[PDB]
Amino acid sequence: NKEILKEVVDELYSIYNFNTDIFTDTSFLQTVYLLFRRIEETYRTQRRDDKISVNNVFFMNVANNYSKLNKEEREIEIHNSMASRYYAKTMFAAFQM
Amino acid sequence: VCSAYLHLCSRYYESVSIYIRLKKVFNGIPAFLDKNCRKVKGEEFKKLMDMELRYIDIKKELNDEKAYKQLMSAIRKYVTTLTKADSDITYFVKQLDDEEIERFLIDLNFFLYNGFLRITEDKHLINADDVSPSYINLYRSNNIVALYILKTQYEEKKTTEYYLKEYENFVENFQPDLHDIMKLQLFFTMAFKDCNVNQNFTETSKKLWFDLLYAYDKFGWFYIHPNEVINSINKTDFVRHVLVSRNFLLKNNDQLTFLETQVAKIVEIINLSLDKLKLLTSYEYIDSIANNYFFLYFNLPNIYSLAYQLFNELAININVITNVPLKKYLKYNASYAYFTLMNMIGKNHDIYSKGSRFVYASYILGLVFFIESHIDIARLYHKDLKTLKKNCTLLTDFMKINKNSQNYSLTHTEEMIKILGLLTVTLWAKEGKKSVYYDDDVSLYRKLMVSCVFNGGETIQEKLANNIEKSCDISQYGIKSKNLKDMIDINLSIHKWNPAEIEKLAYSFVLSCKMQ
Amino acid sequence: ECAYDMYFEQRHVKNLYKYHNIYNINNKLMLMRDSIDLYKTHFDDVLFF
Amino acid sequence: KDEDTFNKTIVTNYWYPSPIKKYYTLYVRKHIPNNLVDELEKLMKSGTLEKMKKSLTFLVHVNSFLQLDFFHQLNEPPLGLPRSYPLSLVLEHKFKE
């Protein structure tokens, strides 16, 4: 969604330009990467269990009652199931370029 | 009841046992504080755990911060006292550091009152079912120390009597109360909410269920004996088998019960439509049922498609041991599926996925897995015939229950399993309401393999070869020798199939024998 | 969409999709249906990494 | 005496004059609020985490695209045609052609 991404990148550029008594230009990228990893790990639940994480992924599923949910909540479920594993990897690329 | 609806009572007594054991733990815990930590919280512990008349809070209520570092210390000491002599879980118990102990001590108090589970996860992925007590709804609500406790402590009409009574006696040396009976009533009304679902189950199929279960847990009557399963796992591969099993039984748990009830339905219909000479083991009779699957309400979703879907899930799980598609080497790696089958029909060890016992589903799914990983070519001519013979003898040698030394007199259970096997093989090839000998769009391979199975052994060609050289008579102006035999077999493979060739050669050489 | 349509016309998929909602679902066919619908909607923006 | 060998030459050394910057650390912890990720979260505006999450909408699940490219061999070929090689070879060939 290339209208919220622009706002986020502008905000981060401002935060970096105003604080150069920290953020030595390679600490900013690492800090942003770890912040993205925390934004990602705030998605994982006990349903859709732990080892169903990376583990040479073939254990991954959506939910035990994915069906019967709705026609519109079971796409939010797809988004959450994907973002729980592939959020930092695909957001950091765009951000850093 | 507990006799007609096997599975609903099997679901009720698990919950009863869980409630009883956790209540025992929580009633043994209070007297412990009156022995160590002489005046931490000795008596008012119960007065705070009253919850009679309420929500819960040990921080705001009891606003004396010099209480946690002793209360939770004593509680952790108690919990590590319960999980003794294992020397592995104790490590993870000592590393808890409340409030991962406070949450346990609150959830365990909430369970023993209202009989619920105190779910605080995403409250849109739960539907009035993920709240009853069971070993799976406890590995999905993050209640994990409870499972440590239940793992360390309390853990290791002939057949009907044996299984039902002689081991569903958790309730022995127990006494109800004025309270505590309402929670049992709640468990019961939770279990029996399917007042028509989980349909037909009575002495028709109930007897067969109990016979197969007793036979497995006494003699080892399965498609492969468990000793062979265990004796092929080299030492350093055992901790991944456990993980490929545990994940198959956690996620695909409702489809297994669905397949179970659907197999029970067809066993009911088989016994209700009615001798073993060739009726019940001939082609046309079994074809009648195989037609019953195309067109109890006569809908009956095909029980081969369900087993194929579960095979697909299992074959995707198995591929976690490498990073290549594993196309034709799904065999040479069937030890995983067979360990899962043992854990599914047998006594399920590894208490994190323990559930029902899935007798029928194991037979059907193991047959389907073997067929689809060994005896199939749809997804990959004399040597082709050698391959047909080799695969047919592998199949016919797999499907025999009892092997070792006992006399083969074909008791009733063996008859029923033979009928189920032949139905599962005639559903693999059938493609419509028309016998699979006269239909096109059925592979050359499948007609021949079905014929090779229904005759129990040899072939469709060598059978007629022996039958014709019986009337050795034919050796005219003329020719015999396997040469004439393969001549008649290519005549078969070209002209048309299948019983046309059988009967027409039969009678042509009957008249040939009466000729000379 | 051609590859998806080729997937959906199999024996074990047709015989199960017949009973779409009169019974339980494998929870896996619904995922494929949802994926193809969502793709056919936003077919000009997606990227595959 | 061993400074001019091959194992001492292909390495970097990174010396710079010491700057005088506020001490925030990305490495561990604790008991003292000196953490770069926490500081960055504190330097942000009110609504920015939810703006960070509302990018990157996921549409095609991995399990929906594997069943056609990886584990394609577990598919009954429909009545008629033989095996159709997976959805990666088809894609690259159709692209080139």
Q: Do A56 and B323 touch (CB under 8 A)?
A: yes
- C-alpha span between A47 and B119 (Å, rounded): 12
Q: Which residues touch A96 (CB under 8 Å, ≥6 apart)?
A: A29
**Are residues B444 and B454 in contact, defined by beta-carbon separation less than 8 angstroms?**
no
SS3 string of B394-457? Answer: HHHHHCCCCCCCCCCCCCHHHHHHHHHHHHHHHHHHCCCCCCCCCCCCCCHHHHHHHHHHHCCC
User: Which chains have at least 3 CB atom pairs separated by less than 8 Å from chain A?
Assistant: B, C, D
Q: Which residues touch A41 (CB under 8 Å, ≥6 apart)?
A: none
Q: Is the dihedral of CA B273, B421, B355, B301 positive or negative?
A: negative
Alpha-carbon gap: D87 to the closest alpha carbon of chain A (Å): 19
- C-alpha span between B27 and B297 (Å, rounded): 52
Q: Counting beta carbons within 10 angstroms of the beta carbon of residue A15, is it exposed (0 to 12), middle (13 to 18) or buried (19 or more)?
A: middle
Amino acid at B456: G
Residues forming beta bridges with residue D35, ordered by sequence position = D25
The Cβ of residue B142 has, within 10 Å, a number of other Cβ atoms equal to 18
How many helical (H) and strand (E) elements, i.e. helices and strands, does chain C have?
3, 0
The Cβ of residue C48 has, within 10 Å, a number of other Cβ atoms equal to 6
Residues forming beta bridges with residue D25, ordered by sequence position = D35
Please write down the long-range contacts of C25-29, taking CB distance under 8 Å and 24 or more positions apart. C25/A67, C26/B255, C26/B309, C27/A61, C27/A62, C27/A64, C27/A65, C27/A66, C27/A67, C28/B309, C28/B313, C28/D63
Q: Which of residues 15-44 of C touch B (CB under 8 A)?
A: 15-16, 18-19, 22-24, 26, 28
**Shortest CB distance from A82 goes to which of D26, D43, D58?**
D58
**Are residues A92 and A32 in contact, defined by beta-carbon separation less than 8 angstroms?**
yes
Q: Counting beta carbons within 10 angstroms of the beta carbon of residue B162, is it exposed (0 to 12), middle (13 to 18) or buried (19 or more)?
A: middle
- C-alpha span between B460 and B497 (Å, rounded): 11
Residues forming beta bridges with residue A76, ordered by sequence position = none
- C-alpha span between C30 and B2 (Å, rounded): 36
* Contact list, B140 vs chain A (CB under 8 Å): 46-47, 49, 64
Helix, coil or strand: residue B502? helix
How many helical (H) and strand (E) elements, i.e. helices and strands, does chain B have?
22, 0
- C-alpha span between B318 and B333 (Å, rounded): 8
Alpha-carbon gap: C35 to the closest alpha carbon of chain A (Å): 9
Structural method: cryo-EM
- The residue of chain A with its CA nearest to that of B324 is A56
- Tokens (6 digits) for B325: 């598609």
Torsion angle (degrees, nearest 10) of CA B287, B291, B292, B295: -170
**Are residues A79 and A62 in contact, defined by beta-carbon separation less than 8 angstroms?**
no
Phi/psi of residue D25, each to 5°? -125, 140
Q: Do C24 and B254 touch (CB under 8 A)?
A: yes
The residue among B506, B437, B429 whose CA lies nearest residue B466 is B506
* Contact list, A66 vs chain C (CB under 8 Å): 27, 30-31
Q: Do B124 and A47 touch (CB under 8 A)?
A: no
Helix, coil or strand: residue B151? helix
Q: Do A1 and D57 touch (CB under 8 A)?
A: yes
**Shortest CB distance from B125 goes to which of A56, A59, A65?**
A65
B441: left (phi over 0), alpha (psi -120 to 50) or beta: left
- C-alpha span between D83 and D74 (Å, rounded): 11
The residue of D57, D58, D60 whose CB has the most chain C CBs within 10 angstroms, and thus the best one to mutate to test that interface, is D60
Q: Do D75 and C12 touch (CB under 8 A)?
A: no
**Are residues B199 and B265 in contact, defined by beta-carbon separation less than 8 angstroms?**
yes
- C-alpha span between B71 and B79 (Å, rounded): 12
**Shortest CB distance from B378 goes to which of D70, D71, D76?**
D76
**Are residues B161 and B211 in contact, defined by beta-carbon separation less than 8 angstroms?**
no
- C-alpha span between B368 and B364 (Å, rounded): 6
Q: Do A67 and C49 touch (CB under 8 A)?
A: no
- The residue of chain D with its CA nearest to that of B314 is D74
Q: Counting beta carbons within 10 angstroms of the beta carbon of residue D93, is it exposed (0 to 12), middle (13 to 18) or buried (19 or more)?
A: exposed
Q: Do A58 and B319 touch (CB under 8 A)?
A: yes
Residues in chain D followed by a break, C to N above 2.5 angstroms: none
- Tokens (6 digits) for B334: 């069937």
From residue B333, how far is each of B224, B238, B370, D71 by CA, in Å? 15, 14, 11, 16
- C-alpha span between B164 and B2 (Å, rounded): 8
**Are residues B124 and A65 in contact, defined by beta-carbon separation less than 8 angstroms?**
no
* Contact list, C31 vs chain A (CB under 8 Å): 62, 66, 78
* Contact list, B441 vs chain D (CB under 8 Å): 79
DSSP character string of B115-148: S-----S-TTS--S-TTS-STTTTTTTT--HHHH
Q: Do B254 and A64 touch (CB under 8 A)?
A: yes
- C-alpha span between B419 and B422 (Å, rounded): 5
- Tokens (6 digits) for C25: 């679902």
* Contact list, D61 vs chain A (CB under 8 Å): 62, 78, 81-82
Amino acid at B389: K
Half-sphere exposure of residue B338, counting CA atoms within 13 Å on the CB side? Answer: 20
Q: Is the dihedral of CA A47, A50, A53, A57 positive or negative?
A: negative
CA angle B356-B357-B362, nearest 5°? 130
Q: Do D76 and B379 touch (CB under 8 A)?
A: yes
Distance of CA B2 to the CA centre of its chain: 21
**Shortest CB distance from B124 goes to which of A51, A58, A73?**
A73
Helix, coil or strand: residue B49? coil
DSSP state, residue B374 = T
The residue among B388, B385, B416, B380 whose CA lies nearest residue B401 is B416
**Are residues B485 and B461 in contact, defined by beta-carbon separation less than 8 angstroms?**
yes
SS3 string of D4-67? Answer: CCCCCCCCCCCCCCCCCCCCCECCCCCCCCCEHHHHHHHCCCCCCHHHHHCCCCCCCCHHHHHC
* Contact list, D83 vs chain B (CB under 8 Å): 379
**Are residues B147 and B139 in contact, defined by beta-carbon separation less than 8 angstroms?**
yes
- C-alpha span between A52 and A80 (Å, rounded): 14
The residue among B124, A87, A10 whose CA lies nearest residue D57 is A87
The residue among B247, B224, B455, B196 whose CA lies nearest residue B335 is B224
- C-alpha span between D31 and B491 (Å, rounded): 89
Residues in chain A followed by a break, C to N above 2.5 angstroms: none
- C-alpha span between B438 and B388 (Å, rounded): 20
Q: Which of residues 62-91 of D touch B (CB under 8 A)?
A: 70-77, 79, 83
- Tokens (6 digits) for B420: 């189920």
**Shortest CB distance from C16 goes to which of B254, B301, B313?**
B301
Phi/psi of residue D35, each to 5°? -145, 130
DSSP state, residue B52 = -
SS3 content of chain A, % helix, strand, coil (to 5): 55, 0, 45
Alpha-carbon gap: A66 to the closest alpha carbon of chain C (Å): 6
Burial state string for C25-47 with b = 16 or more CB within 10 A and e = fewer than 16? bbbbbbbbebbbebbeeeeeeee
Burial state string for B264-292 with b = 16 or more CB within 10 A and e = fewer than 16? bbbbbebeeeeeeeeebbebebbbebbeb
Alpha-carbon gap: C40 to the closest alpha carbon of chain D (Å): 10
* Contact list, D61 vs chain B (CB under 8 Å): none
**Shortest CB distance from B325 goes to which of D70, D75, D79?**
D70
**Are residues B204 and B267 in contact, defined by beta-carbon separation less than 8 angstroms?**
yes
Q: Counting beta carbons within 10 angstroms of the beta carbon of residue A35, is it exposed (0 to 12), middle (13 to 18) or buried (19 or more)?
A: buried
Q: Is the dihedral of CA B173, B179, B184, B185 positive or negative?
A: positive
User: Which chains have at least 3 CB atom pairs separated by less than 8 Å from chain B?
Assistant: A, C, D
Burial state string for B19-46 with b = 16 or more CB within 10 A and e = fewer than 16? bebbeebeeebeeebeeeeeebbeeebe
- The residue of chain D with its CA nearest to that of A42 is D53
Radius of gyration (Cα) for chain D, nearest Å? 27
Query: What is the distance between the terminal CA atoms of chain A, rounded to a whole angstrom?
Result: 16
**Shortest CB distance from D73 goes to which of B327, B431, B441?**
B327
The residue among C42, C12, D54, D31 whose CA lies nearest residue B293 is C12
- The residue of chain B with its CA nearest to that of A69 is B125
Phi/psi of residue B309, each to 5°? -65, -45
- C-alpha span between B193 and C24 (Å, rounded): 17
- C-alpha span between B254 and B251 (Å, rounded): 8
Distance of CA D78 to the CA centre of its chain: 38
Q: Is C26 on the interface with D (CB under 8 A)?
A: no
Q: Do C7 and D75 touch (CB under 8 A)?
A: yes
The residue among B444, B442, B485, B479 whose CA lies nearest residue B462 is B485
What element of type H or E holds B111?
A: helix B102-111
**Shortest CB distance from B379 goes to which of D70, D73, D79?**
D73
Q: Is the dihedral of CA B15, B19, B22, B25 positive or negative?
A: negative
DSSP state, residue B112 = T
Please write down the long-range contacts of A14-22, taking CB distance under 8 Å and 24 or more positions apart. A15/D40, A15/D43, A15/D44, A19/D43, A21/D21, A21/D22, A22/D21, A22/D22, A22/D24, A22/D36, A22/D39
- The residue of chain B with its CA nearest to that of A43 is B122
- C-alpha span between A1 and B125 (Å, rounded): 27
Q: Do B305 and C26 touch (CB under 8 A)?
A: no
The residue among B282, B260, B246 whose CA lies nearest residue B208 is B260
DSSP character string of B217-236: HHT--SSS-HHHHHTT--GG
- C-alpha span between A6 and B39 (Å, rounded): 61
Q: Counting beta carbons within 10 angstroms of the beta carbon of residue B129, is it exposed (0 to 12), middle (13 to 18) or buried (19 or more)?
A: exposed
The residue among A25, A45, A44, A22 whose CA lies nearest residue A88 is A44
Q: Is the dihedral of CA C32, C38, C41, C42 positive or negative?
A: negative
Alpha-carbon gap: B309 to the closest alpha carbon of chain C (Å): 8
Q: Do A15 and D40 touch (CB under 8 A)?
A: yes
- Tokens (6 digits) for C16: 């199960």
- Before B433, cis peptide (omega within 30)? no
- The residue of chain C with its CA nearest to that of B310 is C26
The residue among B231, B14, B242, B26 whose CA lies nearest residue B113 is B26
